[PDB]
Design a protein around this ligand. Structure first.
Ligand SMILES: CC(=O)SCCNC(=O)CCNC(=O)[C@H](O)C(C)(C)COP(=O)(O)OP(=O)(O)OC[C@H]1O[C@@H](n2cnc3c(N)ncnc32)[C@H](O)[C@@H]1OP(=O)(O)O
Ligand SMILES: NC(=O)c1ccc[n+]([C@@H]2O[C@H](COP(=O)([O-])OP(=O)(O)OC[C@H]3O[C@@H](n4cnc5c(N)ncnc54)[C@H](O)[C@@H]3O)[C@@H](O)[C@H]2O)c1
Ligand SMILES: NC(=O)c1ccc[n+]([C@@H]2O[C@H](COP(=O)([O-])OP(=O)(O)OC[C@H]3O[C@@H](n4cnc5c(N)ncnc54)[C@H](O)[C@@H]3O)[C@@H](O)[C@H]2O)c1
Ligand SMILES: [Zn+2]
Lengths: 707, 238
C-alpha cells in the first residue's frame, strides 16, 4: 500500500482515489500524539509525492473518528518554554496546512466523535460527510485554552464568525443535525452508507462537478464580514462571553480576540495570531489548574471501575419520606431509569413529593427540553405508598426521614424487617453519625450513608459515608447507584460533617471572626465572589439559612472542641437570636431579592469586638487558610482516601472555583512551604489556622499534593 | 360537509342550512317564515320525536339517579385488580375523573401494560392541545401501581378485572375481601360469569355487585351495574 504506519494507513482505491484511514493499532481510539502526527506527516508526503493520486479520503477504523490526545501529554507540552511550544505547534499545523494544500479533492468521512484535533483535522479537508450519530466539537476552553491546530482559523471562515465563537467559547459537542445547519459538515448520512457517500462525493469533486478548489479558498483568505460588521459581531461576542464566563476564565474571551485580530489575514498569519494566545494561555494559572481537575477526574474513574467490579446494580430503589428531599431523590432515581418507591406516613407527605416531581418534569417539557412521553416514563417510575408491601424486592433503600437520631434509628430498624437481608440501606443524614445509626440495625454490614445536597436535582455530589461496619460491597452498590443518578459520588468515612460540610464551617468561622473584627460583610463576600466562589460567605449563610447554620455549628463544636468551639457569640448567634433566619425568612445578613438593609448593622453590633482594619488579601486568607488546612486534616485523618477525592469533594459539593483546582491544589499553587508560612502569620487567630505537623514536614521535603 | 358527517338520517342539520340558504336575500320577517317553514316540518319527522324521546328517557334516568345518591356512599379511594387492557382503562378513567385508584396485579409486567396505555391516552390528549401537561400529571399521579394489599386499608370500592375464570375470580374476590373495610364495596367486571355465583364465595355478599365496562373502557358510555341476588341497595347505589 502507498503507506503503512502504526496509526495511519494510506490504501489505494478505484479510479486512482486513495483512502487515508486512522487506525491506531493497540489502543481503542484515535488521538494526535507524537506518533500520529509524525505519521500523518509521512502519509501526506507519500500522497503529495505520488503523482498517481487523484483523490483523497480521510476515514477512521475505530468507533470514534479522532478524539483528543492524552491529557498527560498536554501537561507535558505546556511545560516547555514558549519559543519551543510555538515551534512545536507550527510544525504540527504545517502537517495539516500541507494536507489542505493538496492539489487533490479531499473529503473527511466523519464516522464518530471528532473532538479538538480530531475536528481540526477535518476542518483541513475540502468537503466533509458525517454520520447521523456522530458528533463534533472544540472542547478546548474546558482546559483553559482554545483550538490550537488552526481551529480558530478555519471554523470562522467555514460556519461564520458568530457561530465559530459560539462553538469555541462553549466547547459543546455538536450533533449531526445542527452540524449541517451551520455548514460545518457538507453532507449527513447513516453509518452504513457513509463510506459510499464519501467515495461518491470524491468522484464528483474529481470530475469537476463540484468546484473543490473554490470551496477550500474561503478559509485561505480574510473573513467576509465588513468592517462595521466585524466590530459589531466581535464587540458583542466579547461583551456576551465575558459577561457570562467571568474574569477568571481568559480562554473564552481570548478566543474572540484571536479571531478579531486575524480578521483580515490569510491562513498563515491567522495561524500565528492563534498560537500567539494559545502559548500564553497554556502558561496561565487557570489552564494547568483546570487540567488538574481533569487529571483528578481520571483518578476518580480509575477508582470507579474498581467499584463496579463488585457493585450490585440497583433495579428497584426505595426512599423513605416524600417532600423536599423525598421528591428529589424520587425524581432523580426515576429520571435516570430506576424505579423507586416513595414511602411516607400520611397522604399529605406523598402529595408533597408528587408535587415537585411534576413542576420539574413539567418545566422540562414546557420548554421542549423533555418529551411528554418521556415525562410519562418518569412519573410512572415514581410509585407512592404508605406500607411496606412492595418492598419485597427493593435492592437499595434511601432513608430521608426527619433529622432525628431517635427517629431514624426506629425507621431504619423497621424497614430492615421488610427487605431482603442483602438489601442495602442508606441514610441521607447530614448531622447524625452513620456508624451510630448502624448500631440500631441487625445487619449493619449493609448500612451505609448516601448524602445528597439540596436541591437533590441540582447538586452533582453525593457523599457515600462508609460507616465503621459498612462493607466494601455495601458501599460499591451505593456509589454505582449514585453515579447512575447522573451524580458524582465520593466515598467519605463517617465523621462529624463528613467532608463538604466539615470543610465549609471552618470557612464560615473565618467569616465569623472577620465580622466580629469590624469588617463589613458586604465587602467580605464581594471579595470572595471576586475570588471565584459562586456566592459569598454572607449570602451563602442566608441561602442555607441561619437557623441551619446555627445548628450545624453546635454539631461541629461537639465534634472537634480543640478548634471548632468558640467561647464568644458570633455574628450567627446575633442573627439567629434576632430571628433573621435568612433568605428563607426574608431576612438574614441581607434582606429579601438580594438587598442591603441597615437594620442588620444594629443586630451585629454586639458582636463587633475589635475594629481591626484589614486588607483585601488578608480577608481572602482569613477564609481560605482555615478551609484548606481543614481539607488537609480530612485527608490526613483518612476521612478521604486520596487527595484528588477530597479536592473534588469540594469542586462538586462546595462549588470550589474551578480555575483554582481545589482546596489542596490551591496549596500546591501557592507553595506548600509558602502556604505554611502564610498560615503562621495568622496563627494568632486560632487553632484553626495552625498547620499540621505532617504538613510542615512535606512543606520542608519539597513535597506537594498533586506535584 | 354537514351531510357528509351528520348522515342522511338526521335532517335537522342540513335543513338548518337550506333555511339559511333560502332566506339569503330576505329581511327579518320573510327570513322568519323560511325558519318556521322547516321548523314545522321537522317537529313532525320521525327523527325529531324519536330523539326527543331519548331526552325524555334521560329525564327518567336522572330522576331515578337522585334516588340513588340518597344512600350512595361516594368513592374517594378506588382499587382495580389486574392491569393491562381493562385494568389500564378503569385505572385511566377513574383517575381522569378525579378519583385515585390502586392498580394491583401479580407481576411487574402486568402493571407495565396498564401504565403504558395510561400514557398513550393522556399523551395523545396533551399532544393535541386538548390536555394540559399539568393535568396529565394529576392523572398519572392518581394511578398508583402495586403488587400487595398494604394500601387497601381505606379503599371504598374495589373493581376486580382479573381473567375470565370463575375459579380464579372466586379466589381473588375472596382474598381481597380480607384486606379492605367490611363496608367496602367489591365489584366484578365479569361478562360471562354469574355475579350471584361469584358472590357465594365471599363472606359479605351484601357488598358485592357487578360493574361491567365495555372495551375500550375509555370509549363506551355504558356501565352495567349487575345487582346480584344478595346485592344491597347501597352496594349498588355506590
Ligand atoms: C453549609 C451546608 O450545610 S451545605 C449547602 C451547599 N450549598 C451550596 O454550596 C450552594 C449551592 N452551590 C451551587 O449552586 C454552585 O454554583 C455549584 C455547586 C453548582 C458549583 O458547581 P460547579 O462548579 O458548576 O461544578 P462543575 O459542573 O463546574 O464541575 C466541573 C466540570 O465542568 C467542566 N467545565 C469547566 N469549565 C467549563 C466550561 N467553561 N464550560 C463547560 N464545562 C466546563 C469541567 O471540565 C468539569 O467536568 P469533568 O468533571 O467531567 O472534568
Ligand atoms: N436543610 C435542607 O434542606 C437539607 C439539606 C441537606 C440534607 N437534608 C436532609 O434531608 C432530611 C430531611 O428531609 P426533608 O427536608 O424532606 O424534611 P421535611 O421536614 O421537609 O419533610 C419530612 C418528610 O418525611 C416524612 N416522614 C417523617 N417521618 C417519616 C417516617 N417514619 N416514614 C416515612 N416518611 C416519614 C414526612 O411525612 C415528610 O414528607 C434530613 O436527613 C436532612 O439532614 C436537608
Ligand atoms: N375481550 C375483551 O377485551 C373484554 C371485553 C369486555 C370485558 N372484558 C373483561 O375483562 C376481564 C379480562 O381483563 P383483560 O382483558 O386484562 O385480560 P388479559 O388476559 O388481557 O390480562 C389479564 C391481567 O390480569 C392479571 N391477573 C391475573 N390473575 C391475577 C390475580 N390473581 N391478581 C391480580 N392480577 C391478576 C394478569 O397479570 C394480567 O395483567 C374479564 O373479566 C373480561 O370479561 C374483556
Ligand atoms: Zn445559640
Amino acid at each position: 500500500m502507498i503507506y503503512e504506519g502504526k496509526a495511519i494507513t494510506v490504501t489505494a482505491l478505484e479510479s486512482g482515489i486513495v483512502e487515508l484511514k486512522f487506525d491506531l493499532k493497540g489502543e481503542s481510539v484515535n488521538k494526535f500524539n507524537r506518533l500520529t502526527l509524525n505519521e500523518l506527516r509521512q502519509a501526506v508526503d507519500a500522497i503529495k509525492a505520488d503523482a498517481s493520486v487523484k483523490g483523497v479520503i480521510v476515514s477512521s477504523g475505530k468507533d470514534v473518528f479522532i478524539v483528543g490526545a492524552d491529557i498527560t501529554e498536554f501537561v507535558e507540552n505546556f511545560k516547555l518554554p514558549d519559543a519551543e511550544l510555538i515551534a512545536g505547534n507550527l510544525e504540527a499545523n504545517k502537517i495539516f496546512s500541507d494536507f489542505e494544500d493538496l492539489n487533490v479533492p479531499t473529503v473527511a468521512a466523519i464516522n464518530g466523535i471528532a473532538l479538538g484535533g480530531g475536528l481540526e483535522m477535518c476542518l483541513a479537508a475540502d468537503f466533509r460527510v458525517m454520520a447521523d450519530s456522530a458528533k463534533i466539537g472544540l472542547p478546548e476552553v474546558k482546559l483553559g485554552i482554545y483550538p490550537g491546530f488552526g481551529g480558530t482559523v478555519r471554523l470562522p471562515r467555514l460556519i461564520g464568525v458568530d457561530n465559530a465563537v459560539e462553538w469555541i467559547a462553549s466547547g459543546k459537542e455538536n450533533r449531526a443535525e445542527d452540524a449541517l445547519k451551520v455548514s460545518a459538515v457538507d453532507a449527513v448520512v447513516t453509518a452504513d452508507k457513509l463510506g459510499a457517500a464519501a467515495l461518491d462525493l470524491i468522484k464528483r469533486a474529481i470530475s469537476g462537478e463540484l468546484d473543490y478548489k473554490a470551496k477550500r479558498q474561503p478559509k485561505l483568505e480574510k473573513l467576509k464580514l465588513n468592517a462595521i460588521e466585524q466590530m459589531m459581531a466581535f464587540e458583542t461576542a466579547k461583551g456576551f462571553v465575558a459577561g457570562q464566563a467571568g474574569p477568571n476564565y481568559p480562554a473564552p474571551v481570548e478566543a474572540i480576540k484571536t479571531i478579531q485580530k486575524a480578521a483580515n489575514f490569510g491562513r498563515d498569519k491567522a495561524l500565528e495570531v492563534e498560537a500567539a494566545g494559545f502559548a500564553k494561555l497554556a502558561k496561565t494559572s487557570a489552564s494547568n489548574c483546570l487540567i488538574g481537575l481533569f487529571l483528578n477526574d481520571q483518578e476518580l474513574k480509575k477508582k470507579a471501575k474498581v467499584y463496579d467490579k463488585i457493585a450490585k446494580d440497583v433495579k428497584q430503589a426505595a426512599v423513605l419520606g416524600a417532600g423536599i428531599m423525598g421528591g428529589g431523590i424520587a425524581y432523580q432515581s426515576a429520571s435516570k431509569g430506576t424505579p423507586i418507591l416513595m414511602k411516607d406516613i400520611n397522604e399529605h407527605g406523598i402529595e408533597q413529593g408528587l408535587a415537585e416531581a411534576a413542576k420539574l418534569l413539567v418545566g422540562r417539557v414546557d420548554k421542549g427540553r423533555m418529551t411528554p412521553a418521556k415525562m410519562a416514563e418518569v412519573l410512572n417510575g415514581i410509585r407512592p405508598t404508605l406500607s411496606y408491601g412492595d418492598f419485597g424486592n427493593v435492592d437499595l433503600v434511601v432513608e430521608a426521614v426527619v433529622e432525628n437520631p431517635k427517629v431514624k434509628q426506629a425507621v431504619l430498624a423497621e424497614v430492615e424487617n421488610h427487605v431482603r437481608e442483602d438489601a442495602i440501606l442508606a441514610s441521607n443524614t447530614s448531622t447524625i453519625s452513620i456508624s451510630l445509626l448502624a448500631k440500631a440495625l441487625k445487619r449493619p454490614e449493609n448500612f451505609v450513608g448516601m448524602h445528597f445536597f439540596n436541591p437533590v436535582h441540582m447538586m452533582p455530589l453525593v457523599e457515600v459515608i462508609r460507616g465503621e461496619k459498612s462493607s466494601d460491597l455495601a458501599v460499591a452498590t451505593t456509589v454505582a447507584y449514585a453515579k447512575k443518578m447522573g451524580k458524582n459520588p465520593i466515598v467519605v468515612n463517617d465523621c462529624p460533617g463528613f467532608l463538604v460540610n466539615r470543610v465549609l464551617f471552618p470557612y464560615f468561622g473565618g467569616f465569623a471572626k472577620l465580622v466580629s473584627a469590624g469588617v463589613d460583610f458586604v465587602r467580605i463576600d464581594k471579595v470572595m465572589e471576586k475570588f471565584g466562589w459562586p456566592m459569598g460567605p454572607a449570602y451563602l449563610m442566608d441561602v442555607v439559612g441561619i437557623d441551619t447554620g446555627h445548628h450545624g455549628r453546635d454539631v461541629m463544636a461537639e465534634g472537634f472542641p480543640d478548634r471548632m468551639k468558640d467561647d464568644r457569640r458570633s455574628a450567627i448567634d446575633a442573627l439567629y437570636e434576632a430571628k433573621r433566619l435568612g433568605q428563607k425568612n426574608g431576612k438574614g445578613f441581607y434582606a429579601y431579592k438580594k438587598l442591603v438593609d441597615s437594620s442588620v448593622l444594629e443586630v451585629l453590633k454586639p458582636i463587633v469586638y475589635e475594629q481591626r482594619d484589614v486588607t483585601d488579601e488578608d480577608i481572602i486568607n482569613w477564609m481560605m487558610i482555615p478551609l484548606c488546612l481543614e481539607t488537609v486534616r480530612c485527608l490526613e485523618d483518612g476521612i478521604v482516601e486520596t487527595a484528588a477525592e477530597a479536592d473534588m469533594g469540594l469542586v462538586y459539593g462546595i462549588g470550589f472555583p474551578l480555575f483554582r483546582g481545589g482546596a489542596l491544589r490551591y496549596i500546591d499553587s501557592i507553595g506548600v512551604a509558602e502556604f505554611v508560612a502564610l498560615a503562621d502569620q495568622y496563627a494568632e487567630l486560632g487553632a484553626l489556622y495552625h498547620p499540621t505537623a505532617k504538613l510542615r514536614e512535606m512543606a520542608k521535603n519539597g513535597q506537594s499534593f498533586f506535584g
